[PDB]
Design a protein around this ligand. Structure first.
Ligand SMILES: [Cl-]
Ligand SMILES: [Cl-]
Lengths: 522, 522
């Protein structure tokens, strides 16, 4: 199935990729701190994103505030940037997510069988409408299914709407009640005119922003999946409805990805692998502008370490907007990691009322494709998809991060610290920085095998061990180790920077290296 | 004196470096949005910082949340992370900063002269104690100087303490009242043990965090100086009080910087330029650990574009902690851009109660040096110190950003878009990326001189113009222009990437280039 997450989490906590925020205070749900190793990974993911989108598409980056006054979020959704129905408990006051309790409790009596078959079908009919039940309706369903507090046990209260925005006051007194932005896309809209003027009024242009957003979750209890603070990457691509073709679609048309259309969901079909070019041809994917980004998102996700076999794109379906969500399969099931919405009528129209004056005195209300990246979930998906366990009964752990994402690409290992290795270590380190390869000198105590096990544990792609022979014999050669296979070669210490650079940047494979340079074993 | 800021601000707004947040709503004070050009600059500043500190000192980066519960900030300062005295107005309710009104009003009657000389001395005696007057005391001073609302005009209310933290509720209901972090340093303290364990319990180690902090200012009205949301870079360097020597101090001991000690302030002396090595020797700067960071901060600030002649380091003085603040001179006067505090008794002690077990069963309470960077103010300081005006009565504008900080380093200018230049433009762009030089192809309409004026306006360091001769004559050569001097050369289009790389990275000077490659003029 998925992954031994109990092991993975232990390694993630022990090596301090990330951990519970304010742990020495009991901790806060939905809040996490990222350690040195987690930051390196996060920064690499974000940097890879900047190269994949901002640099590639000439996107106009923006940096807006997280503090937003009330009036601004009233023209978007003081209700629907999001409010979840919340049921309280008339003692023990504990709050719950309505959709969650009803669903879980339905699955309880849905599978408890002195029960009926006609009830199964009834509860299925209800589950297929959960997300779209209004308030009353839901309250009735709570009473009609006798839903009580899961962990015992008192009766429940009519599900009331609960806004997921963090309230605050921007200033002295209380005349400017503000909100912590629940999403980054809105800041871009408010800046459409300045962005348009910056692009000289021309019209295909993309605007992006990488920052934190806040969602006041009722009861987050699923690790990095449901969190209250998270880093998000947003793109707002603006197109003239007339020219709905992307000139660069042919670069992606040939990809094969799993598509899970709305119609495939209505009629209980399965996710279907499909050529992206065919997808647009067959009409399952509306246009090539939407198609291009879907393929670029696919390329980015697989590049960062997500498995293609556990990656799908789900179109939603009457639950306005043509959205395809990049979903990854984890131990929590299929989670939405990247949203990509095609939108005719959008949220700039509400805000500003902007338009672009395409020549001849015509005001154009541009269509908008907005790919939104859940960076933390993307990061967590990499953990699960990349985590492996080695053979021995000292069941050792390692992450198979792509070199472009791993905390650092190379680890130099000199034998027990001697004034002897230093000049060689220093030269390797300096030469390694000159080829743009990240590294950390291992000044750690233990066997040469135990030290590599530690670096494997955090996913370091490569390793160079410097021994006495390296210092004292005259082709000065050290050994290069591959993380995944654990296989080693013996190359000249002055060429190593070049071949590690060529391995990180997929210019050559390990097989290529083992074909040019001698093998090594202990 | 300083700078024609009225002009600078116009250019900063017109080119959209940054602008007022929510402008189309009346705007919010202390909140600003950074445009495409501003982001490029900001990202470059931050990246230069990561290289200058994190990479150079092997600092352990961390990523903590901005949401902090009440109890955590109660062990730091529910009063003194900061509360400013605020005076309200018994009609027109307008709120004011007490320290501000009193000072401004004192300077009013301090310089209004049917007045006395003995009053001058009295008001000076008061001004030299402003920051340290308690609440009553201050209320009396308000009455005793008959301080009324500046912009008319009703009587004022006793100055009450006003916490500058943004209040919020982390969760459903209201049992976990939280705060938006006013500073980044605290998150590092709470993670001292995990950071210590990550450093294997050894003890000199530095921990850093780059993120946003929030300060609910009463009435911000000084551009990017006093803001409510800002990006901050924090370093927490932990040292054993026994080994208070930095092995790398000799790399900085030879710098010459202006030092403004506490004793020089008490006895109205002037800021004094001084060799950093001498400074530690003469005892003005306590130790070399503090000294090293002061010099590293100086190096960073000048590297990013701040003028050495308008940069000083001010030690404060009974207003616990040995702090030196990097201050820059602007049109607003001397502003604190980087704080650097040497602290014996710190804020981990309050939080956790951590310690490091230096061998032999001794628990060490480590001293902490914490350089904190106000990135936005640093950025603004660069604007003022770097902004210039060219000669002609079409008074043209340009920013002299260092190449390492400028939005992008190079601008390629082909003559009016022709299928002719494209292959040369494409090759230059691709070759330019291969040498790690940022660039943007100018697809703009206008004269070849007007187009460069536009790129100069945003501070682009270099420019390469491709003309017909470049395409049709057989040493294919284009012209390279220097931003500052406007001088040009004519080099082979395939060598240009190398020499632009060598100019950006201060490997060679423009004079060197003009000594190897032919000159050009129109
Ligand atoms: Cl996320
Ligand atoms: Cl700042």
């Amino acid at each position: 199935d998925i992954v031994d997450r109990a092991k993975m989490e232990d390694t993630l906590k022990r090596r301090f990729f990330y951990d519970q925020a304010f742990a020495i205070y009991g901790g806060v749900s939905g809040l996490y701190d990222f350690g040195p190793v987690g930051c390196a990974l996060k920064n690499n993911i974000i940097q890879t994103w900047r190269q994949h989108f901002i640099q590639e598409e000439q996107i106009l980056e923006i940096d807006c505030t997280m503090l937003t006054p009330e009036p601004v979020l009233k023209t978007s959704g003081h209700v629907d940037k999001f409010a979840d129905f919340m049921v309280k408990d008339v003692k023990n006051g504990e709050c719950f997510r309505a959709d969650h309790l009803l669903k879980a409790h339905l699955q309880k009596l849905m599978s408890d069988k002195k029960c009926s078959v006609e009830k199964k079908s009834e509860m299925e009919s209800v589950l297929a409408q959960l997300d779209n039940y209004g308030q009353q309706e839901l309250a009735d369903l709570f009473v009609n299914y006798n839903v009580k507090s899961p962990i015992t046990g008192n009766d429940l209260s009519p599900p009331v709407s609960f806004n997921l925005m963090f309230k605050t006051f921007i200033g002295p007194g209380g005349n400017m009640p503000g909100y912590l932005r629940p999403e980054t896309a809105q800041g871009i809209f408010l800046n459409f005119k300045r962005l348009l003027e910056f692009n000289q009024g021309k019209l295909p242009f993309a605007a992006a922003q990488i920052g934190n957003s806040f969602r006041n979750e009722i009861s987050p209890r699923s690790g990095l999946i449901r969190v209250r603070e998270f880093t998000m990457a947003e793109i707002e691509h603006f197109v003239d409805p007339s020219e709905k073709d992307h000139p660069k679609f042919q670069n992606v048309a040939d990809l094969h990805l799993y598509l899970y259309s709305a119609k495939a969901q209505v009629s209980g079909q399965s996710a279907r692998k499909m050529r992206l070019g065919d997808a647009v041809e067959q009409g399952v994917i509306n246009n090539t502008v939407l198609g291009y980004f879907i393929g670029r998102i696919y390329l980015y996700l697989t590049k960062v370490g997500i498995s293609p076999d556990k990656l799908r794109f789900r179109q939603h379906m009457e639950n306005a907007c043509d959205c395809w969500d990049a979903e990854s399969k984890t131990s929590y099931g299929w989670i939405e990691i990247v949203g990509c919405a095609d939108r005719s009528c959008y949220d700039l129209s509400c805000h500003a009322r902007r338009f672009q004056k395409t020549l001849y005195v015509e005001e154009v209300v541009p269509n908008v494709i907005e790919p939104s990246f859940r960076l933390g979930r993307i990061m967590y998906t990499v953990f699960e998809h990349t985590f492996h366990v080695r053979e021995g009964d000292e069941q050792r752990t390692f992450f198979s991060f792509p070199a472009v994402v791993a905390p650092f690409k190379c680890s130099v290992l000199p034998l027990s610290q001697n004034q002897e290795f230093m000049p060689f270590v220093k030269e390797l380190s300096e030469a390694l920085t000159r080829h743009g390869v990240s590294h950390k000198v291992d000044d750690s105590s233990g066997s040469i095998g135990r030290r590599y096990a530690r670096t494997d544990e955090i996913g370091v792609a490569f390793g160079v061990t410097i021994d006495f022979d390296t210092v004292n014999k005259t082709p000065h050669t050290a050994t290069l180790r591959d993380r995944d296979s654990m296989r080693q070669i013996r190359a000249e210490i002055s060429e190593l920077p070049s071949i590690v650079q060529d391995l990180a940047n997929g210019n050559i494979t390990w097989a290529d290296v083992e074909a040019r340079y001698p093998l090594f074993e202990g």
